[PDB]
Amino acid sequence: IVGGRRARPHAWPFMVSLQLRGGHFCGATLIAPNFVMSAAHCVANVNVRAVRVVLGAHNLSRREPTRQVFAVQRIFENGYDPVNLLNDIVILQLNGSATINANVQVAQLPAQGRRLGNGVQCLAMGWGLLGRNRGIASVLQELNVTVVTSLCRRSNVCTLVRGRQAGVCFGDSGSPLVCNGLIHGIASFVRGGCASGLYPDAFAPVAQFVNWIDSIIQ
Template sequence: MASSLLETLLFLLISISTHGGPVWGSKIVGGRTAVPHSRPYMASLQRGSHFCGGTLIHPRFVMTAAHCLNGQNFQRIQVVLGAHNLRNRERTQQRFQIQRVFENGFNPQNLQNDIILLQLEGTATINANVQVARLPGQGQNVVAGTQCLAMGWGQVSNSNRAIPTQLQELNVTIVTQNCRTGNLCTLVPRRRAGICFGDSGGPLVCNGVVHGIDSFVRGGCGSGFYPDGFAQVSRFVQWINSIIQKHNYSAQRSRRKRATWREELFLPV
């Protein structure tokens, strides 16, 4: 029972800030600073400060972990795109409120189906610093031994709560041992490194494709023994596409209605 409770607590990826409040943010343990704006699909979810990551998958949609917003008022959350150094109000940054949240059977007890889509109030401007990520095909697998990249902002380690301002990244390897069905899992061979508190929601990129969403750790951050867990994006691609297609259809219909109204208003006689 105690072991189960410990794993549940670790799953939640919550840490306490120096101000005493809950923080859903942190860092890749044992990683390196990313080349500025080299991961243009990376999003920062902020509630005053960064607490979770996300991935831009459409100019109006960001994909993240469902547990990031579980119990949160999404209207108080801001999505920041085009960021590298969170300490600065970079000119590359684009900031959006959230219009709507889409979830798909998330279970907060065991973090199954740990995925949500955030529809932005506005459309991201696609440029060199803000770009849409590539997603896998429905059911596409990633084999053990595949080299991938995890990334995020936040704490340096389990004990050090100082938050680095620049985006961090880490090379990781896909493993299947001690990985439950429905998740992707990674380890860093021969090193205590991995995702940590609140890298939650950020992307796991394998061969240029976002295959995972940072979800949970066991045995502490960068334990060197337990693999880190990610929601497997390929299980949800059809659902993702259906949400985006409905939005595109609604937007096109709205534009047609406005065009018809303008034509009627300015009908020549």
């Protein structure tokens, strides 16, 4: 997240951090106690038998007792198209089931095919790069953004921060877009670099998947 602010610890306890030996590479959502939802592209070409799913994280550079670490048992994809960046969703079934508590809770999804109107105020959030030089976040960042249908396709949900250059960056993929309490996007892709100020960012439209996610978490 470029130009966002430090979230309040565990102010979003459905927020997951997918990690490899060295560190965070993408974000995810706790959609069930034993399932997480992220961006397909994040695990397409990773050794998923190495990936760690860290729940209850806040300051990744720190040591937090708060945290619960799983491993992915299985992946469910729904026809990612890497060359058009279509259906950039996955689900990751964990080798366990977490302990729901204050710092780890399950997100609500919207209803099947709820379409987001232009103008809708949402919150984008991630541990991705803080900007064209500043590295990846230690502390979870959150960003106020708006739904924009211009410069977008209908098979994404697109956000834009008007009048500043701010938005999602590398490693924010997989991360939720929470609109009105409900998880409307997953962080897929940027145009022009991050924080272009011109092109909206693009999120996999969760409400277009919901019935699929449902038949998989029940």
